[PDB]
């Protein structure tokens, strides 16, 4: 964990956080960050074990909700979800850069290379398929990011900065599950009293604001994982986050077989550097088998994505309709 | 509380007073949804219509609390069914309604009886406006589709089939629109004007509510509406027959364009069908004419009489 | 629901200027397009959406595209309305000033630059979703105007078969240029029989006479007649620009006024109005609406055969005088025995954001009639055309493009226009007979 | 994944657009023409990041990480005198070789080959002044022969000198050429290396530049400097995703991931709304447009900076970055409308991508009509049309071999036969590139991996 905090300080120096590190008003906040390592058992990788927590102290701990040992670990599960997403995205980026560099090397030292044409075609198409996979991944990731950041900004503008530029909506309504809309409490007059500072929140009010914010985060349908209140996708029998985790596992297997294919291609490249098309026939056969495997994985994932689109369209939510249309 | 703005809002909502645009837009946006919810059962999902309604309410200005608190609901009974429930009359369409949860202290003046009256009047106006919208859509399909305006092949059909149904649609328009203008001017307009002129320097809020309920009663106790309801229940079925006939003829027009005598036999079937339909409409019109001539109370009545007098 | 205005020719540009000024004064928009209403109250009962596009600046740009072969009149209209119209909604064909008063040159200009106008109208329609139809402002007498109108009518009928298209066309007065002007008219009239879904007729001679009657100076300027047409167009659109309960669509008005697509030519009337006391009751208003000296077209008929009549009375009116005038009019107006004796009245609300017109509290009324008087002016025009055609072959000298390559096709097109207007007037005069609907009775 | 990028100014156009881009960046980051940040160095909190493009020696000074390379010392001296202390004099390369002996690509390639040691030393020294580096942004100015040759030389050096760095390029093509043969030959020779080594290339056809400068500016006469201002503003808007990093795209490699479907298709088509930081930018508040209208204009051919030639064009990677106060519902509506109005290849279900940027806290805030702008980049095959006519020129002049006595000097081959063979090879390369682009316009392209496995 000393190399860990060293890398943390270095990344802070590279990022704009160094500015906050320079300002003493922000050094206290930047020092309150304390990464944590969760005991997930022996044999796992750093991409699955490393967590990023923040340690708060009074008088701050009495307002902001942290991943307390007796809490619900909202930030913990959210960071784990975003961490798996970022891990998939980084793996896609690594495969992309490896493929791009190796194809650039081919183009540099191909000369004529007549027998490579078909292989180059296959590699281009497979990189396009990987690009489509990464596009779907980053698409779901960006949709999640958009919804999350929308929640954040609406919270700031309506909960953290409510007393500044209020909504002016003096009407407090309550929606019932049977479509009934009832006015909450007594109706106040339009500020007219016979006549002839800031409505700010205290400790517990701000803490309840934070907790309701976390709840609105976790109460999202796509975040409603393994709950009886969520509806499962039609013709699938599985909840939407369940099918999402299944698709994440599928695309991770796709990334791994793509890494294997890239290793095979690098070995074939080294062989071409060694001799001029006199060997690597077994490597060509293994390349063909990996191509067939990748095609099968792509077909299965496309069927799963079509089922997911059908579920989003038939769920009733217009936002799911829009997401399935955009994926379509 | 500015009671004048609230009463203006409720007149716009439940009475359509100076708000025909909003309700017309809502009807045009979801004609298909209404017909698919009225032809199906209660088990059919209407959540799409509810989502459209809440979206329209969100696009509504937040100051209009009467429209911001507007809530939609589906009933298990039809409008003539609840009319038979509340009034001694004899009647799966028009199961929709809208309601408002009047808060304190506004609930002590805006009671639930006036709310039920508003719901009844709103469902009635919705029926009327949907029928007028169906007539407008029929006229649009007739005057815009090229097959309807197209003629040829020694027609014998345009003058007999097209001209006849056009005259029939004209008759239905001269009936529905006439009675709508009559009810909205001699009843709706006069009651709106009285409601406007009464709150000028008021004395008792209970007196205001009593005047409001008395106007609602005069709207309900109108002999024209009571005489129309049973005849309306048949005129609307005649309108449904007319529009399904229009759809069938529109589907047949593209096929009749040029060789087979079976097509002529189908044309004979259609001409006897529409002649029988016109005769049935004429008989229902004569029945309603007898019913209104037996009524006693007459300007708009004389106008409707002139409309129903055969040329 | 949204409607787009089409100003063809200098006449169209003038009447569009006048109408948009009138509507900006009514809806409190002014000559700068900015909302003349305060931002404290958003409650409104009018509808500026179908005629004005409101941007983030809350400026109302008129939903109108100006098409003409004369850039000077359009530039002048822009100068008098600096900051009101959109420069992108301006179309002058980039061909310079006008040249040739024949329908051939105008239609050829329309065919050559049809792509730009199509792109403009597609961009205007894509700005919104709920569109209903277009409004065409042109004079049948003007050659370039009539050619552009016929070209755009063809484009909108073979491009938008679902959008009802209505037009405003003013027939020229008894003058000298008709010998060629009528030509354009009948050609346009040809398309008016084929693609025009609706048309409001006007006769320039009767318009000039009625203006000289209402105006003190008999030297009637064309801008005064343009003001009259702007007033009548704002009046017929009052039910659309100010809908309350009954009429909220021009489709309904053409339903209650146009019984069949073959008969879509209506004659207007409007009385009383200024362009300061009240002396015309609603009963008097309607009996004047019946009077020929209040119609915007030369009647030239003793007892015209009214088919379907519909009127809108503007002002605060009691239904008693309404019913009295309705009974008197039914006693006065004759209907065919095969058609209905339908008479409908719309109570048009006054705009509280409009400056008070002279003769305040004076109730007014507009009426649209379908009778055999429109066919009388049509017969006058067709007779003038037939005389000047069968008597002199001079039209073979002023043609452009496909019409200039051969004049025999021009003669054939003119003969076909004569034939179709003859069939139209025959259908009209047959509708006057009870035996018109004899095929069902 | 974010690294520093160094700007490469090659040719007179390259140096002019570099000057304009650095002035625009100084305007955005309040650095001015003196190299000293116009903001006091006491405010440490900065939402932007000048480090990827500005080296900070003193706290108030930010030296632009760029090298000035040209054969004409007059323009370099002019830019240095206008930007007193802004640029680094040690990063200004002229080689003292005098004026260019013609507009031949061979001349520039030779002057880059002979002085390759000095420029490589300067590049290595600049790399030593940084730690986290990602790649370069090269300005070709392929309209000039010496500039195109110098750009090709730098590309041929940096492809094998730094294979682990992503090399993006910016080629500016002219509308009309006084001697189309020479400029066509220079552009073909540069495009050969672009296909071989360049990782990303943005084309800039001067026809649309002249058209836009005549449309939005009041003056009918078009000056080259405010025309280069357009390209500089474009480059600043595209680099905004790193200078003002958003929450979706934070690295040039990530930006090119969604823009480069394959190393073969590495030529993009740009588009931008009416700018706001240009000279005559007062006629922008009268537009009264929304974000949906901004997207429409980005998809409109009138706002494309290259020759559109839109005859049912096939798109491959449509992306956009929107700067300003952007609304998500307008974005969703615009995406819905564009997916109904954009031709996509049926073999790929990938649609267009939308990105939203942030406005600088020190840039002049515009009225609510043009307060939000946007840039669009679409992978289209129509770019080869810009070369097609050029190849046509080749195809109609290479039968004789005019101007051959000018491409024989400087390069490694003085004979006519070797130069002819090299030109034929470059023509074959660009022909194969056009064939790849026209094959990508078909579904059989992706079906090639389906027919065999
Ligand atoms: N009432 C009225 N009619 C006009 C006005 N301007 C033109 N007109 C009509 O237009 C006819 C004359 O033709 P022009 O307006 O010159 O149309 P044109 O022949 O195509 O010539 P250009 O409009 O210049 O292209 C007259 O008979 C009028 O009926 C006007 O301002 N008021
Ligand atoms: N639009 C535009 N194009 C330019 C500009 N400067 C140069 N060019 C292009 O460059 C071509 C002329 O070549 P130069 O850029 O001067 O290159 P060169 O001839 O080798 O001269 P040096 O670069 O000074 O060595 C012209 O055809 C232009 O298309 C400019 O400022 N604006």
């Amino acid at each position: 964990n000393y190399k860990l905090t060293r890398v943390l300080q270095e990344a802070v120096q590279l990022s704009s956080l160094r500015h906050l590190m320079n300002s003493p008003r922000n050094s206290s906040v930047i020092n309150g960050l304390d990464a944590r390592v969760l005991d997930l058992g022996h044999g796992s990788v750093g991409w699955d074990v490393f967590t990023l927590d923040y340690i708060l102290y009074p008088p701050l701990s009495l307002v902001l909700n942290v991943n307390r040992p007796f809490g619900r670990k909202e930030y913990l599960r959210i960071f784990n979800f975003l961490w798996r997403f970022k891990k998939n995205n980084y793996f896609y980026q690594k495969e992309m850069l490896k493929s791009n560099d190796i194809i650039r090397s081919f183009k540099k030292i191909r000369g004529y290379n007549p027998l490579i044409r078909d292989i180059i075609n296959k590699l281009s198409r497979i990189s396009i398929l990987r690009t489509q996979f990464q596009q779907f991944n980053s698409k779901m990731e960006s949709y999640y990011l958009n919804c999350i950041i929308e929640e954040n900004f609406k919270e700031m503008t309506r909960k953290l900065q409510r007393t500044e530029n209020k909504s002016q909506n003096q009407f407090d309504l309550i929606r019932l599950n049977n479509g009934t809309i009832e006015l909450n409490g007594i109706l106040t007059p339009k500020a007219e009293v016979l006549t002839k500072i800031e409505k700010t929140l205290n400790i517990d009010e701000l803490e309840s604001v934070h907790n309701t914010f976390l709840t609105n985060i976790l109460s999202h349908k796509l975040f409603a994982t393994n709950t009886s209140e969520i509806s499962v996708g039609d013709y699938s029998g599985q909840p939407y986050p369940t099918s999402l985790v299944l698709l994440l596992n599928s695309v991770y297997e796709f990334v791994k077989v793509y890494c294997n294919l890239n290793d095979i291609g690098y070995e074939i490249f080294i062989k071409m550097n060694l001799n001029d098309h006199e060997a690597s026939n077994g490597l060509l056969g293994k390349f063909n088998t990996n191509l067939k495997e990748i095609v099968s994985q792509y077909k299965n994932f496309k069927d799963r994505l079509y089922i997911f689109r059908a579920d989003l369209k038939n769920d009733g939510d217009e936002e799911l309709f829009l997401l399935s249309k955009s994926l379509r | 509380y500015d009671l004048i703005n609230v009463l203006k809002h409720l007149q716009q909502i439940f009475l359509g007073y100076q708000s025909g645009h909003n309700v017309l837009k809502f009807l045009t946006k979801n004609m298909g949804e209404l017909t698919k919810h009225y032809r199906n059962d209660n088990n059919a999902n209407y959540d799409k219509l509810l989502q459209n309604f809440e979206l329209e309410r969100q696009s509504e200005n937040p100051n209009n609390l009467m429209r911001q608190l507007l809530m939609i609901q589906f009933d298990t009974e039809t409008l003539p069914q609840v009319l038979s429930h509340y009034l001694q009359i004899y009647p799966a369409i028009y199961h929709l309604k809208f309601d408002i949860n009047i808060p304190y202290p506004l609930n002590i003046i805006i009671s639930r009886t006036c709310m039920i009256k508003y719901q009844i009047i709103l469902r009635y106006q919705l029926v009327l406006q949907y029928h007028s919208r169906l007539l407008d859509e029929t006229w649009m399909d007739l005057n815009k589709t090229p097959s309807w305006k197209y003629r040829g092949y020694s027609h014998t059909v345009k003058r007999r089939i097209v001209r006849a149904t056009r005259v029939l649609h004209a008759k239905m328009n001269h009936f529905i629109k006439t009675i709508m203008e009559y009810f909205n001017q001699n009843v709706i307009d006069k009651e709106v004007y009285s409601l406007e002129k009464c709150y000028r320097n008021p004395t008792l809020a209970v007196a205001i509510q009593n005047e409001l309920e008395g106007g609602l009663t005069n709207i309900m106790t109108n002999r024209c509406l009571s005489d129309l309801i049973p005849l309306q229940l048949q005129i609307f079925d005649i309108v449904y027959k007319f529009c399904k006939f229009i759809k069938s003829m529109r589907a047949k027009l593209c096929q009749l364009d040029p060789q087979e005598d079976a097509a002529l036999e189908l044309i004979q079937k259609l001409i006897e069908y529409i002649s029988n339909a016109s005769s049935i409409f004429r008989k229902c019109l004569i029945n309603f004419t007898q019913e209104l001539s037996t009524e006693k109370f007459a300007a708009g009545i004389e106008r409707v009489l002139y409309s129903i007098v055969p040329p | 629901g949204e409607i787009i205005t089409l100003q063809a020719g200098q006449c169209g540009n003038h009447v569009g200027k006048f109408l948009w000024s009138q509507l900006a004064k009514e809806h409190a928009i002014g000559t700068d397009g900015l909302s003349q209403l305060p931002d404290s109250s958003t409650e409104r009962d009018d509808d500026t959406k179908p005629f004005f596009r409101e941007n983030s600046r809350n400026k109302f740009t008129p939903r109108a595209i100006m098409m003409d072969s004369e850039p000077s009149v359009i530039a002048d209209v822009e100068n008098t309305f600096r900051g009101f119209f959109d420069p992108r909604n301006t179309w002058v064909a980039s061909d310079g000033a006008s040249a040739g008063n024949s329908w051939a040159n105008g239609y050829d200009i329309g065919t050559r630059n049809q792509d730009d106008i199509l792109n403009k109208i597609d961009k205007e329609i894509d700005s919104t979703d709920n569109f209903e139809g277009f409004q065409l402002l042109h004079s049948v007498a003007g050659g370039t105007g009539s050619g552009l109108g016929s070209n755009l009518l063809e484009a909108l009928c073979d491009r938008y078969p679902k959008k009802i298209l209505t037009t405003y066309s003013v027939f020229p007065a008894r003058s000298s240029e008709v010998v060629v002007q009528s030509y354009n008219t009948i050609l346009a009239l040809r398309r008016l029989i084929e693609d025009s879904d609706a048309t409001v007729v006007f006769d320039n001679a009767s318009l000039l006479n009625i203006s000289g009657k209402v105006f003190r100076n008999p030297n009637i300027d064309l801008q005064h007649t343009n003001q009259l047409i702007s007033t009548i167009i704002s009046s017929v659109t009052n039910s659309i620009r100010f809908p309350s309960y009954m009429y909220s669509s021009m489709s309904s008005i053409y339903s209650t006024l146009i019984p069949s697509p073959e008969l879509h030519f209506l004659s207007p009337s409007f009385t009383p109005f200024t362009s300061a006391h009240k002396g015309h009751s609603s009963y008097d208003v309607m009996l004047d609406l019946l009077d020929p000296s209040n119609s915007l077209v030369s009647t030239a008929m003793n007892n015209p055969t009214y088919f379907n009549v519909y009127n809108t009375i503007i002002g605060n009116v009691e239904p008693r005088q309404i019913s009295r005038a309705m009974t008197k009019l039914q006693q006065r107006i004759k209907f065919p025995s095969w058609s209905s004796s339908a008479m409908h009245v719309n109570i048009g609300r006054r705009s509280p954001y409009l400056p008070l017109q002279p003769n305040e509290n004076e109730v007014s009324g507009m009426m649209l009639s379908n009778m055999s008087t429109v066919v009388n002016v049509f017969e006058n025009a067709c007779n003038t055309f037939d005389k000047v055609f069968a008597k002199g072959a001079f039209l073979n000298n002023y043609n452009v493009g496909d019409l200039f390559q051969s004049m025999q096709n021009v003669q054939d097109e003119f003969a076909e226009s004569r034939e179709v207007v003859q069939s139209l007037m025959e259908d009209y005069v047959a509708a006057e007979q009870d035996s018109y609907l004899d095929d069902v009775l």
Side-chain angles (χ1 to χ4, degrees), chain C residues 215-281:
Chain C
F215 289 100
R216 209 50 52 196
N217 188 26
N219 186 20
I220 292 305
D221 187 14
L222 280 182
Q223 308 308 313
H224 307 158
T225 314
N226 300 324
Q227 175 66 61
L228 301 177
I229 306 304
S230 52
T231 52
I232 192 71
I233 294 182
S234 45
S235 297
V236 59
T237 54
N238 170 268
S239 87
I240 296 98
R241 303 166 306 108
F242 304 94
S244 185
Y245 57 94
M246 186 55 190
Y247 285 98
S248 289
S249 87
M250 48 84 76
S251 166
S252 79
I253 304 185
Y254 286 150
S255 301
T256 191
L257 274 167
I258 299 180
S260 88
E262 303 85 9
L263 293 80
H264 62 276
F265 297 86
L266 302 179
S267 44
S269 45
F270 184 45
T271 181
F273 68 107
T274 62
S275 182
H277 63 276
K278 49 168 305 303
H280 315 93
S281 88

Side-chain angles (χ1 to χ4, degrees), chain A residues 198-241:
Chain A
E198 314 97 343
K199 197 249 183 179
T200 48
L201 302 182
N202 50 9
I203 307 101
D204 70 331
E205 278 171 333
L206 293 172
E207 194 161 30
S208 45
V209 162
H210 190 296
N211 301 328
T212 52
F213 171 63
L214 296 189
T215 306
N216 301 324
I217 292 175
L218 309 193
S219 46
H220 193 277
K221 189 267 293 179
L222 291 179
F223 211 86
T225 317
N226 314 137
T227 78
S228 69
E229 58 193 3
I230 192 173
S231 87
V232 300
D234 53 327
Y235 312 102
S236 87
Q238 311 301 325
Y240 298 89

Side-chain angles (χ1 to χ4, degrees), chain B residues 4 8 22-23 35 47 69 88 93 111 120 129 156 196 213 218 222 246 259 270 285-286 292:
Chain B
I4 52 171
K8 173 184 179 181
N22 296 325
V23 287
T35 187
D47 307 331
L69 206 62
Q88 292 74 14
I93 323 178
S111 44
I120 294 176
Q129 196 161 355
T156 318
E196 170 269 347
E213 302 318 299
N218 302 334
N222 209 327
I246 286 292
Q259 310 87 38
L270 296 181
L285 175 62
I286 292 303
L292 63 92

Side-chain angles (χ1 to χ4, degrees), chain A residues 160-215:
Chain A
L160 297 193
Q161 287 80 230
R162 194 263 178 181
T163 173
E164 301 86 4
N165 185 57
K166 303 180 180 180
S167 158
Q168 193 259 308
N169 200 333
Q170 299 289 336
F171 315 134
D172 52 354
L173 78 162
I174 302 177
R175 298 282 300 272
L176 305 189
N177 264 277
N178 57 15
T180 302
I181 320 178
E182 189 201 271
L183 193 139
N184 186 24
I186 189 171
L187 174 55
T188 183
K190 302 174 180 174
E192 186 271 331
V193 172
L194 298 169
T195 43
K196 42 211 169 292
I197 298 284
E198 314 97 343
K199 197 249 183 179
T200 48
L201 302 182
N202 50 9
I203 307 101
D204 70 331
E205 278 171 333
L206 293 172
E207 194 161 30
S208 45
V209 162
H210 190 296
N211 301 328
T212 52
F213 171 63
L214 296 189
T215 306

